[PDB]
Design an enzyme around this catalytic site. Sequence first.
Site, mmCIF file in Angstrom:
data_model
loop_
_atom_site.group_PDB
_atom_site.id
_atom_site.type_symbol
_atom_site.label_atom_id
_atom_site.label_comp_id
_atom_site.label_asym_id
_atom_site.label_seq_id
_atom_site.Cartn_x
_atom_site.Cartn_y
_atom_site.Cartn_z
ATOM 1 C CB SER A 71 -0.934 0.013 1.179
ATOM 2 O OG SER A 71 -1.844 -1.075 1.110
ATOM 3 C CG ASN A 96 2.334 -7.780 8.077
ATOM 4 O OD1 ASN A 96 2.117 -6.565 8.126
ATOM 5 N ND2 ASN A 96 1.514 -8.640 7.489
ATOM 6 C CG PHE A 100 -0.718 1.416 5.653
ATOM 7 C CD1 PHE A 100 -0.775 0.262 4.886
ATOM 8 C CD2 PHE A 100 -1.908 2.089 5.913
ATOM 9 C CE1 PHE A 100 -1.995 -0.254 4.472
ATOM 10 C CE2 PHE A 100 -3.127 1.601 5.457
ATOM 11 C CZ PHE A 100 -3.167 0.411 4.761
ATOM 12 C CB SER A 165 -9.145 -5.225 4.670
ATOM 13 O OG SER A 165 -8.306 -5.304 3.536
ATOM 14 C CB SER A 166 -4.215 -2.384 6.821
ATOM 15 O OG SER A 166 -3.090 -2.580 7.668
ATOM 16 C CG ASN A 168 -0.868 -4.434 10.968
ATOM 17 O OD1 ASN A 168 -1.202 -5.033 11.993
ATOM 18 N ND2 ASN A 168 -0.438 -5.057 9.883
ATOM 19 C CB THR A 169 -3.925 1.795 9.842
ATOM 20 O OG1 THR A 169 -2.616 1.726 9.275
ATOM 21 C CG2 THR A 169 -4.341 3.250 9.909
ATOM 22 C CE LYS A 206 -5.220 -7.452 0.217
ATOM 23 N NZ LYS A 206 -3.784 -7.356 -0.124
ATOM 24 C CG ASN A 235 -5.161 -7.103 4.140
ATOM 25 O OD1 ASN A 235 -4.077 -7.531 4.563
ATOM 26 N ND2 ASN A 235 -5.339 -5.855 3.722
ATOM 27 C CB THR A 236 -3.040 -10.435 7.131
ATOM 28 O OG1 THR A 236 -3.198 -9.047 7.429
ATOM 29 C CG2 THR A 236 -1.906 -10.661 6.164
#
Length: 347
Positions: A71, A96, A100, A165-166, A168-169, A206, A235-236
Site C-alpha cells: 500500500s 506482520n 503502512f 482491511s489492514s 495495523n492502522t 480489498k 487481506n491478513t
Amino acid sequence: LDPESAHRLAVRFTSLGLLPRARFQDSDMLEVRVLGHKFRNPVGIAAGFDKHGEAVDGLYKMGFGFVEIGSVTPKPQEGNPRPRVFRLPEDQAVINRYGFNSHGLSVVEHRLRARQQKQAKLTEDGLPLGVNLGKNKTSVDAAEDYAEGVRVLGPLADYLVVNVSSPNTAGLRSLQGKAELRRLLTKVLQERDGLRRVHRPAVLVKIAPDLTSQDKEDIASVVKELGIDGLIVTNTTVSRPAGLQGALRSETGGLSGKPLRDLSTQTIREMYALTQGRVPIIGVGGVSSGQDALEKIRAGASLVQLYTALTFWGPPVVGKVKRELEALLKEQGFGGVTDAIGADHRR
Ligand SMILES: Cc1cc2nc3c(=O)[nH]c(=O)nc-3n(C[C@H](O)[C@H](O)[C@H](O)COP(=O)(O)O)c2cc1C
Ligand SMILES: Cc1c(Oc2c(F)cccc2F)c(OC(C)C)nn1-c1ncc(C2CC2)cc1F
Ligand SMILES: O=C(O)c1cc(=O)[nH]c(=O)[nH]1
C-alpha cells in the site's frame, strides 16, 4: 536474517533482476480477460512485497501474470517500531504489523513515471499493474487520503485497490461498515471517473477475512449499487486459528500463509454468491500450489495472488503454481482458467 532484513534484500535482489528468468512459458489455458485487461497468467504478487514500486520489472521476470504495488500512503511515513515481522515456520505463516511504511505518493509517482511506457507495453502484452492505496496514520479524512491516491497514481495503474482491511492502522477496518463505505467509495469512483479515458483504472475493494455476515452483506450491496469493478479477498487475519505452533503466534498483527488459506477461500465463496458472480474477485491467502489456486478459482476468483509462499518456497513457487494449475485444469476437464471460475457454485 530477521524477516524484515530478508524482505529488504529480496526487494533489492528482485529490482536488480538477480534471479533466474522463469523457464515456464505460459500456455493459452492460463489467459484471463477481466477488469478490461488481458492477464497472460492468473498468478499475481499480492500487495506488501513491493510497497514502494521498486521491483515491478523483476516481479514480471519471476513469472507473475500481474503485479500489485503498495500500500502507498499520501505522505511518507515510517510505520510501526521494529521488530514488526515474525516468521511462524511450523505453520508456514507470517505475522506482520508494518503499519503502512510508505515512501508516499510523490516518490512512487516518479518511480512509475520513469517506466510508464514500458508498463503500457507490458499491459498490452498481458502483464497489468495494480496500485494499492492506503491512508496516513494521522489522517482526519480517510476518503480524502484515498481520493489523493486516485488522482496521483490512478493515471499510472491498470487497477487501484482501496485497502479498507489492514489490521495495523487504528480505525481503518471500520471503513468496511455500510453508510461510511458508500460515502468513501462514491468519492473514490467520482475521482476515478474524473481521469482521462486512457488513464482511467478499474477500482477494487480489498477486504479482511474477519468480517461479520452483516459486514459481507453490506459490502456486497454497496459494491453492486456503485458499480465497483472488483474485490480482493482477502487481506491478513487478526484471528489466530486453533492449532498454530509457532512460538510467535501471539504477536500483534496480520497472519498470512497456510493458516489463512481456507478462511480466505470461504470468504471468496461467500462474496461470489452475494454478488451473483457479476463482480470479479482476486483470490489471495495461503496459495502455495496449483490446488490452492484452483480451489480459489472454483470458489469464484478470476485471478489469484500469493506472497507468504515466496518466503517458504522462494521464487520457484510461481512456476510451480502455474504448472500444477495447468495440470489440474486438464485433469478436471476445463478448457482453461476461465471455464473453472465459480465452478463450485454450479455444483
Ligand atoms: C509482510 C506483509 C506485508 C503486507 N502488506 C500489505 C499492504 O501494504 N497492503 C495490503 O493490501 N496487503 C498487504 N499484505 C497482505 C497481502 O497482500 C495478502 O493479502 C496476504 O498476505 C495474504 O496472502 P498470502 O497468504 O499469500 O501472503 C501484506 C502481507 C504481508 C505478509
Ligand atoms: C521472497 C524472499 C526471498 O527470495 C528471493 C531470493 F532468494 C532471490 C531473489 C528474490 C527473492 F525474492 C528471500 O531471500 C532471502 C533474502 C534469502 N527472502 N524473501 C522474503 N521476502 C519477503 C519477506 C517479507 C517479510 C515477510 C521475507 C522474506 F524472507
Ligand atoms: O502495512 C501493513 O502493516 C499491512 C497492511 C495491510 O493491508 N495488510 C497487512 O497484513 N499489513
